[PDB]
Each structure stands twice: as structure tokens, then as C-alpha cells.
């Protein structure tokens, strides 16, 4: 779920 809402670790490739 591509959703960066308050997340240092929101890189998922």
C-alpha cells in the first residue's frame, strides 16, 4: 500500500 503518512520507512520497491 503506497502510502507515506508519517513513516521514516516508507520505501518499498
Swiss-Prot record:
Membrane topology value: Single-pass type I membrane protein
Subcellular location: Virion membrane; Host cell membrane; Host endosome membrane
SS bond partners: 4-10
Function: Acts as a class I viral fusion protein. Under the current model, the protein has at least 3 conformational states: pre-fusion native state, pre-hairpin intermediate state, and post-fusion hairpin state. During fusion of viral and target intracellular membranes, the coiled coil regions (heptad repeats) assume a trimer-of-hairpins structure, positioning the fusion peptide in close proximity to the C-terminal region of the ectodomain. The formation of this structure appears to drive apposition and subsequent fusion of viral and target cell membranes.
Subunit details: The mature envelope protein (Env) consists of a homotrimer of non-covalently associated gp120-gp41 heterodimers. The resulting complex protrudes from the virus surface as a spike. There seems to be as few as 10 spikes on the average virion.
This protein's name: Transmembrane protein gp41
Species name: Human immunodeficiency virus type 1 group M subtype B (isolate BRVA)
Gene: env
Span of the entire protein shown here: 591 to 603 of 852
